[PDB]
Paper text:
Guidance receptors of the Uncoordinated-5 family (Unc5A–D) have emerged as key players in navigating cells and axons (Hong et al., 1999; Leung-Hagesteijn et al., 1992), where they trigger cell-cell repulsion in response to extracellular ligands such as fibronectin leucine-rich repeat transmembrane proteins (FLRT1-3) (Seiradake et al., 2014; Yamagishi et al., 2011) and netrins (Hong et al., 1999). In agreement with previous findings (Verschueren et al., 2020), we show that [name] receptors directly and functionally interact with the morphogen receptor [name] ([name]). All glypicans share a similar architecture: a structured N-terminal extracellular core domain, followed by a C-terminal linker region of ∼80 amino acids (Kim et al., 2011).
Human and murine [name] sequences are 94% identical and the two structures are similar (Cα root-mean-square deviation, RMSDCα = 0.54 Å for 353 aligned atoms). Crystal structures of the core domain of human GPC1 (Awad et al., 2015; Svensson et al., 2012) and the fly ortholog Dally-like-protein (DLP) (Kim et al., 2011; McGough et al., 2020) revealed an α-helical architecture comprising an N-terminal lobe (N lobe) with 6 conserved disulfide bonds, a central M lobe, and a C-terminal lobe (C lobe) that contains a furin-like convertase cleavage site (RXXR) (de Cat et al., 2003). Compared to previously solved structures of fly DLP and human GPC1, [name] has a more curved shape. Superposition of hGPC1 (Awad et al., 2015) and hGPC3core results in an RMSDCα = 8.87 Å (for 358 aligned atoms). We modeled glycans on two predicted N-glycosylation sites (N124 and N241 in hGPC3, N123 and N240 in mGPC3) into evident electron density.
Residue numbers in the entry: 35 to 39, 59 to 186, 192 to 310, 315 to 349, 383 to 434, 456 to 477
Write the structure that this text describes.
């Protein structure tokens, strides 16, 4: 043994003498772990950055659309229903606040936003528009629904906005989930047998005192196919996630729906006032964007074989003798080579988001 870069070892199969002890064997084991990790990192980096890019852009683009709709809706109220301000400035803000929250994954029930909106809207219509001239607020909030003053305008808005806010939410959910599974890949822990085999493949030749010999490609594939056995099962679910995503995008907006809200609300106010006469009395008694989507799907399809091409990536981006001549077989230099929990969580997450994508478009 010159420079290197009995027997009681536990990894390197000792044909006879050996250059390395049990302690240098443990060194070689940890550097195999570090090496596999770096390689997995490099495999997943470009795809990870792609989805990180678009998740950040699309989130702001959608946030811009909500802010613009809020101000337009606020301005339309200020201009057409000044008697309803400043109260309108408050329930419009309440609604679009929940819009963004619902878009970004918060537990928000759409039927509320609409119902809270109309529950807040009706008392100020009654007091300021229908019968001009504080303790009686809660009665009017209850009579709004008990007397169905807006007809089916709330249901109409409910379906108008729930369909458009659901697709936008799920699109952001799927982008962030892809980041989360791909980022999990470079942290995948493998079996101890795989680690011992990786050590034999990459480093045990130095223990026999060889300097330039590389492992056989065939030996690398048998080793890698054995290491990535659970990982390759993820391929079919990843391909369905890509295709389901491509389905959603080809089917697509939220701007028109949210911009159109004031028009629908205004007609709902007109409906109510068509009944002010009798309604007062009873209440008296009672009381390039699309271009970005395309380019993302284009780049995303180029990575559709990520999990199936992964073992080949590790073998090709490490020194191997793909020729299978004068190569290291794990225990001797040969002339020609002859012969889950975390994974299941990735599966489950891909299954869940793939249902959500399917049943949308
Ligand atoms: C548009 O709406 C958003 C809502 O948060 C607000 O921050 C922004 O200042 C508005 N722009 C105006 C009022 O010019
Ligand atoms: C990636 O995974 C690591 C470890 O699991 C975690 O610390 C990090 O926050 C994750 N990053 C993203 C963007 O998911």
């Amino acid at each position: 043994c010159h420079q290197v870069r009995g027997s009681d070892l536990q990894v390197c199969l000792p044909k006879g003498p050996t250059c390395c002890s049990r302690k240098m064997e443990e060194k070689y084991q940890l550097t195999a772990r570090l090496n596999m990790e770096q390689l997995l990192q490099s495999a997943s980096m470009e795809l990870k950055f792609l989805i990180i890019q678009n998740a950040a852009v699309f989130q702001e683009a959608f946030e811009i659309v909500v802010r613009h709709a809020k101000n337009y809706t606020n301005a339309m109220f200020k201009n057409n229903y000044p008697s309803l301000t400043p109260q309108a400035f408050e329930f419009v803000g309440e609604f679009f606040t929940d819009v963004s929250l619902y878009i970004l994954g918060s537990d928000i029930n759409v039927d509320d936003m609409v119902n809270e909106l109309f529950d807040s809207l009706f008392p100020v219509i009654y007091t300021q528009l229908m019968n001009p001239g504080l303790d009686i607020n809660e009665c009017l909030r209850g009579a709004r629904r008990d007397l169905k003053v807006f007809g089916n305008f709330p249901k109409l808005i409910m379906t108008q906005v729930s369909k458009s806010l659901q697709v936008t939410r799920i699109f952001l959910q799927a982008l962030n989930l892809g980041i989360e599974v791909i980022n999990t890949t470079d942290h995948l822990k493998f079996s101890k047998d795989c680690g011992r085999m990786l050590t034999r493949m990459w480093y045990c030749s130095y223990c026999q005192g060889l300097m330039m010999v590389k492992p056989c490609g065939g030996y690398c594939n048998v080793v890698m196919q054995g290491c990535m056995a659970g990982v390759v099962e993820i391929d079919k679910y990843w391909r369905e996630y890509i295709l389901s995503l491509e389905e959603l995008v080809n089917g697509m907006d939220m701007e028109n729906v949210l911009l159109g809200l004031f028009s629908t609300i205004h007609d709902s106010i007109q409906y109510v006032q068509k009944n002010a006469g009798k309604l007062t009395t009873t209440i008296g008694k009672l009381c390039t964007l699309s271009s970005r989507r395309r380019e993302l799907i284009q780049k995303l399809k180029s990575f559709i074989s990520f999990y199936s091409a992964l073992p080949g990536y590790i073998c090709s981006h490490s020194p191997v003798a793909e020729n299978d001549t004068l190569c290291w077989n794990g225990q001797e230099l040969v002339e020609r080579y002859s012969q889950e929990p975390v994974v299941s969580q990735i599966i489950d997450k891909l299954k869940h988001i793939n249902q959500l994508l399917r049943t949308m478009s």
